Sequence to fold (232 residues):
Amino acid sequence: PREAAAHWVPFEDKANMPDNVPDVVEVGATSAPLLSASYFIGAKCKPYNDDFMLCREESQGSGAIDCLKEGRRVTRCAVSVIEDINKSCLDEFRLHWQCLEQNNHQLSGCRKAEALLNKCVFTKLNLEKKIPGLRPDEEPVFLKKDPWIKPAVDDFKSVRAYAEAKKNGTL
Amino acid sequence: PSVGQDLPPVGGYEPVQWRRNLPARGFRPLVYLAALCGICGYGFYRALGGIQERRELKREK
Fold:
C-alpha cells in the first residue's frame, strides 16, 4: 500500500486475541540481526514459508484469518534459528550486525564477519548461505576475492578477528 | 666637441629578439585523442564492472 498523507495519528488497540486462536511468541529481533540471519532462516524455513504463501494464495481474500497456523509455524522456525545462533554463535553474530549498523545495512561492508558467521553456523548448525537463481558460471558476490566495491572503513574488531582466525586456521 | 655624451659601445650591443617566439609545442593531436579514448575506455570498464557487482549485491539483499 501507500504511506500516510497530510496527517496521521498513530492509534493502538489494547485488546487481546480471541480465545480460539492460540498463543505464539514473537521474534523480537531488530532489523540488523534479522537481516544477518535471513539466509540461515530461509535455508531452514523454506517449506514452511512456501506453505504459508500458498495458503494465503488459495484463500483468495481470507488469508489473514485462514493462514494463522502457517504463520505460527513460520514464527517458531525463526525463533529456533535465532535461539540456536545466540546460544552458539553469539559474538560472531554481534560482529556482523554491528558492522552492518555502522553502514547503511549494505552487506558489502561486513564480508569478514559474514565469513566467520557462515563458517561457524555451517560447522555447528549445518546451514549454509546460498543465492539461488544463478548458473554454475556466475560467481556469487560474497565469495569474490577482490571485489570492486569496498567499504569506506573496514570494521576494526572484524578485521582483528579475521586475521587471528587465518592465523589459527579457523578459516 | 663631445666629452660627456651618452654614446654607444664600440662593439655595439648584442642583438635582441624581435621576431616571433611562439614555438609550437605539444604532441601531435591524435595522441591526445588516443589518450582520451583510452582513458574513457578504462573508465567505462571500471564503471560497468561496478554496475554488475551492484547488481549482485542487490540480488543478495
Notes: Residues 1-171 of chain A form one domain. The two ends of chain A are 45 Å apart (CA to CA). The longest helix of chain A spans residues 68-88. Chain A touches chain B at residues 106-108, 131, 133, 138, 140-142, 144, 147-149 (CB under 8 Å).
